Design brief:
Chain A: This is Pilin. The structure is cut from a larger assembly and holds two copies of chain A. Chain A has three helices and no strands. By secondary structure, chain A is an all-alpha fold. At the A-B interface, loops of A face loops of B.
Amino acid sequence: FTLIELMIVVAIIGILAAIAIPQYQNYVARSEGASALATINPLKTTVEESLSRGIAGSKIKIGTTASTATET
Amino acid sequence: YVGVEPDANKLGVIAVAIEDSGAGDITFTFQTGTSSPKNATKVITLNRTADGVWACKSTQDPMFTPKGCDN
């Protein structure tokens, strides 16, 4: 092992560092907003259809309970 | 008998109330739970006078009122 060998390794370590890391939280925030909008968008169909069929607005709830003829 | 049940149309019930003099009306009252909120509890009345004149009166919104029925 020579000192030139180790100094070249140190220089290449420094060069391999310093790689600029761009902003990434904006991408995550935008994806979260898109996911939320895509999650709550189909619920417009449920509310509108239930209101069209006469189901009371107070009877339109959120859950996995089996919807009856009066509750959705 | 008219041949249909009062609740034959699920939107609302139908009531026929004709007096002996010939005056009467035929009403269609939308029922809550089976009709849209805009039309709920609204009545479409086919009033008949003792002289045999038929008229249609509706309590719905003017935009939703069908043609030929006054609002």
